[PDB]
């Protein structure tokens, strides 16, 4: 078929700049943060399905 | 940083020290000076002398 | 034709035990069959048996205490060294707590534990648990 459309969608999408955000911790501190999130303090545990990236 | 471990020799005289010590350990004391030429210069001079015969070998370099 | 009369004997005992019967007829009998039966009986797996003496070859009636889960033969009779006995008894036995591997040995026909006690190997005849 025709090769005219090659960077069609990638070129035609509106370019949105990455937002500025503070750096994430690394190494033992990042794992400490993960451990605290998963295990130490967890309120919404009442027998329902919750995911770490739930948008609802 | 507590401590440093090394090795040491104490010779009976300075003459025995000059006789038995490695030349670099004598040079560290100022009692020896090595050749100022390099290995490269000596090797190329030797291979050049190889091309001449007789007393002309001393007349090289 | 029939080779390994011990194989036939052990398979007949196995099938009779599965059928729940209290006695099994084994023919022909042989020295190896009798020694294997004695090994099985010293551990309480079969109970007393009787040798019907024909004038050609033996017959045996084995009383069957319902304890035999499985008696089997290994063909061919692989030669087994003491260092290789654990692998055989790990492949053939259901547990390390019970079950025996029978070996023919220069010291006689006997189970693997007693073969270890006599510090000797041999040829694997079969197993029972």
């Amino acid at each position: 078929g025709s090769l005219a459309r090659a960077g069609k969608v990638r070129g035609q999408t509106p370019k949105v700049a990455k937002q500025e955000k503070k750096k994430k911790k690394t190494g033992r501190a990042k794992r400490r943060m993960q451990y605290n999130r998963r295990f130490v303090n967890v309120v919404p545990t009442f027998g329902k399905k919750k995911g770490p990236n739930a948008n609802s | 940083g507590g401590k440093t471990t090394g090795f040491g020799m104490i010779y009976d005289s300075l003459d025995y020290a000059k006789k038995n010590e490695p030349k670099h350990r004598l040079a560290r004391h100022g009692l020896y000076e090595k050749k100022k030429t390099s290995r490269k210069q000596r090797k190329e001079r030797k291979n050049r002398m190889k091309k001449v015969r007789g007393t002309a070998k001393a007349n090289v370099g | 034709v029939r080779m390994n009369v011990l194989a036939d004997a052990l398979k007949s005992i196995n099938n009779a035990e599965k059928r729940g019967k209290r006695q099994v007829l084994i023919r022909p009998c042989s020295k190896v069959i009798v020694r294997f039966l004695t090994v099985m009986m010293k551990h309480g797996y079969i109970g007393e048996f009787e040798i019907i003496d024909d004038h050609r070859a033996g017959k045996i009636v084995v009383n069957l205490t319902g304890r035999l889960n499985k008696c089997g033969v290994i063909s061919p009779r692989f030669d087994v060294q003491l260092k290789d006995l654990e692998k055989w008894q790990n492949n053939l036995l259901p547990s390390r707590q019970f079950g025996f591997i029978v070996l023919t040995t220069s010291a006689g026909i006997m189970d693997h534990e007693e073969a270890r006690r006599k510090h000797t190997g041999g040829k694997i005849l079969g197993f029972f648990f």
Partner: protein, 141 residues
Amino acid sequence: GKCRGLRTARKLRSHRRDQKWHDKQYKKAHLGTALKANPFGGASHAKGIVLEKVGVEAKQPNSAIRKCVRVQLIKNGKKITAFVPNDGCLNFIEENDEVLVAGFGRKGHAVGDIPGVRFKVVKVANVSLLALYKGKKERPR
């Protein structure tokens, strides 16, 4: 049934040797026709010159124009069709330029929609396609 005899080692070994040839993977590996027929000649990657850009129609359940290139391998001169993975990445490749090509991931087998294509372009002009796609590097003029 199989032979169970103390002296059947020759029969068992010969039977295994013969019946291993009826295994597709073993015969392909040990026969030599596959290595002769392999364009890379057993290599993981290969360099070629982009002869042209082609568009391959995806197989019937799907509808797309997969952008590939016909390249000719430097090592042996064979003509290969190599997929150009991401989008707009065909704009980075220009005809008659050097390209480093790898397998498509299925050991000489077509992948997904693209029929008869078992190679993908990894580098073009000695700079990776991933660096060009993300803007890390640019085409050398």
